Design an enzyme around this catalytic site. Structure first.
Site, mmCIF file in Angstrom:
data_model
loop_
_atom_site.group_PDB
_atom_site.id
_atom_site.type_symbol
_atom_site.label_atom_id
_atom_site.label_comp_id
_atom_site.label_asym_id
_atom_site.label_seq_id
_atom_site.Cartn_x
_atom_site.Cartn_y
_atom_site.Cartn_z
ATOM 1 C CG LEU A 186 -7.853 -14.962 16.527
ATOM 2 C CD1 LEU A 186 -7.818 -13.715 15.387
ATOM 3 C CD2 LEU A 186 -6.617 -15.815 16.404
ATOM 4 C CB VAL A 233 -13.190 -13.948 18.319
ATOM 5 C CG1 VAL A 233 -14.193 -14.816 17.374
ATOM 6 C CG2 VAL A 233 -12.412 -12.907 17.574
ATOM 7 C CE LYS A 243 -23.925 -10.250 15.622
ATOM 8 N NZ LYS A 243 -24.029 -10.967 16.752
ATOM 9 C CB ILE A 283 -23.767 14.898 21.165
ATOM 10 C CG1 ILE A 283 -23.631 16.416 21.251
ATOM 11 C CG2 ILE A 283 -24.747 14.142 21.030
ATOM 12 C CD1 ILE A 283 -24.327 16.981 19.798
ATOM 13 N NE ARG A 314 -3.905 9.493 14.052
ATOM 14 C CZ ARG A 314 -4.149 9.321 15.362
ATOM 15 N NH1 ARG A 314 -5.097 8.896 15.601
ATOM 16 N NH2 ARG A 314 -3.214 9.378 16.274
ATOM 17 C CB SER A 338 0.163 6.920 21.207
ATOM 18 O OG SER A 338 -0.096 8.080 20.669
ATOM 19 N N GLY A 396 -4.207 11.718 18.889
ATOM 20 C CA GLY A 396 -5.588 12.085 18.573
ATOM 21 C C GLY A 396 -5.896 13.302 19.625
ATOM 22 C CG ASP A 397 -6.055 13.366 23.110
ATOM 23 O OD1 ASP A 397 -5.297 12.341 22.762
ATOM 24 O OD2 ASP A 397 -6.763 13.559 24.291
ATOM 25 C CG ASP A 416 -7.942 16.343 28.257
ATOM 26 O OD1 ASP A 416 -8.490 16.929 27.660
ATOM 27 O OD2 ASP A 416 -8.496 15.262 28.673
HETATM 28 NA NA NA Z 1 -19.791 12.607 21.458
HETATM 29 NA NA NA Z 2 -12.085 -16.853 20.910
#
Ligand code: NA
Ligand code: NA
EC number: 2.7.7.7
Length: 330
Positions: free
Chosen positions: A57, A60, A67, A101, A144, A175, A184-185, A251
């Site tokens: 894929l 990757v 891993k 932060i 959300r 979106s 999300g905003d 925003d």
């Molecule tokens: Na932050």
């Molecule tokens: Na790959």
DNA sequence: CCGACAACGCATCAGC
DNA sequence: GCTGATGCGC
DNA sequence: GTCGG
């Protein structure tokens, strides 16, 4: 899409590493590599059985394939287990959840003993204005936003913007504009005809809009505000007795009319659709970005930007068929 | 082997 | 005070 | 970490 069950262990795994490289290591690019790797795997309609399999894929590689083998043969990831127990890393990781932060501030806090929300509450004057608001709305910001609310939020934004001045034009993108059932905003793109590339950016165009929204009490806090971009906090009014809605992020951006629709398309995405939009613009012979679209000569040299007064306009240029925002998911 | 990887408006920090 | 660097938003 | 000039 495929059920989390399939490779959610892998995807959660890669996402964890992603937040780690982002919050602890400050390796934004690795963060995106893990994020990307995680996505392409999340849409894979097959239960991965080997690291080699995943490697096929795009996104990757060797490291992640290795891993993935370890996770399948053992059920966990050594580097990941030692990270979760590392009280320093897990502290820095937690603190970045607070808006304002970033990895740096989070590192500084952790070093001087500040590691929990409580500690943040105790050390107010050690936090800037942005960070205080992020703390004040820690809970809310992680919630959300349901579509029906974006609608309500949208109804208010439009009414007010229109109540300020009829010539304005605002478009909630993100979106949501594409039918997402949750956001999300809110990202409002605004513009006024009295503003172009070579026009008086009138320091009250965006201002008077934020001004009005503040009056109607929809906008509750400001994180940053300039002549072209506003980042604050907003909230939908509750009904008598009824529980109050959570504070949301919003925003508002002021774009020059000659770039409006061009940007509207951009901040509407998605990102994958924006690239199939990028590469295509090339072949056909045009350069695309968030502000303008320019004709490309026989040697890369882009000429002056073309006129645009609608999303379709841009589409007709690259001789593509206007693809509704609902089908721009890719 | 090694640079790109999206980007830039704003707030705040470093330095002169 | 001013100019530039850096941190941040995802 | 991955891709690719
Ligand atoms: Na932050
Ligand atoms: Na790959």
């Amino acid at each position: 899409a495929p059920q989390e069950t399939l490779n959610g262990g892998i995807t959660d795994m890669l996402t964890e590493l992603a937040n780690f490289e982002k919050n602890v290591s400050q390796a934004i690019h690795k963060y995106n590599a893990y994020r990307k790797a995680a996505s392409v795997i999340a849409k894979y309609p097959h239960k991965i059985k080997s690291g080699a399999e995943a490697k096929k894929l795009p996104g990757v590689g060797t490291k992640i394939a290795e891993k993935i083998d370890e996770f399948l043969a053992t059920g966990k990831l050594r580097k990941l287990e030692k990270i979760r127990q590392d009280d320093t890393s897990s502290s820095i990781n937690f603190l970045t959840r607070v808006s304002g932060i970033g990895p740096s501030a989070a590192r500084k806090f952790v070093d001087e003993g500040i590691k929990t929300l409580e500690d943040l509450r105790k050390n107010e004057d050690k936090l800037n204005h942005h960070q205080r608001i992020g703390l004040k709305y820690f809970g809310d910001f992680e919630k959300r936003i349901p579509r029906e609310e974006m609608l309500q939020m949208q109804d208010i934004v439009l009414n007010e913007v229109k109540k300020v001045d009829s010539e304005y034009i605002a478009t909630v993108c993100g979106s949501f504009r594409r039918g997402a059932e949750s956001s999300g905003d809110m990202d409002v793109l605004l513009t006024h005809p009295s503003f172009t590339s070579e026009s008086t950016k009138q320091p009250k165009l965006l201002h008077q809009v934020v001004e009005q929204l503040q009056k109607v009490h929809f906008i509750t806090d400001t994180l940053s505000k300039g002549e072209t971009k506003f980042m604050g906090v907003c909230q939908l009014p509750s009904k008598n007795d009824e529980k109050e809605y959570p504070h949301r992020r919003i925003d508002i951006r002021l774009i020059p009319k000659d770039q409006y629709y061009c940007g509207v398309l951009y901040f509407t995405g998605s990102d994958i659709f924006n690239k199939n939009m990028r590469a295509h613009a090339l072949e056909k012979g045009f350069t695309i970005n968030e502000y303008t679209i320019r004709p490309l000569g026989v040697t890369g040299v882009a000429g002056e930007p073309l006129p645009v007064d609608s999303e379709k306009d841009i589409f007709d240029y690259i001789q593509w068929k206007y693809r509704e925002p609902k089908d721009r998911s890719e």
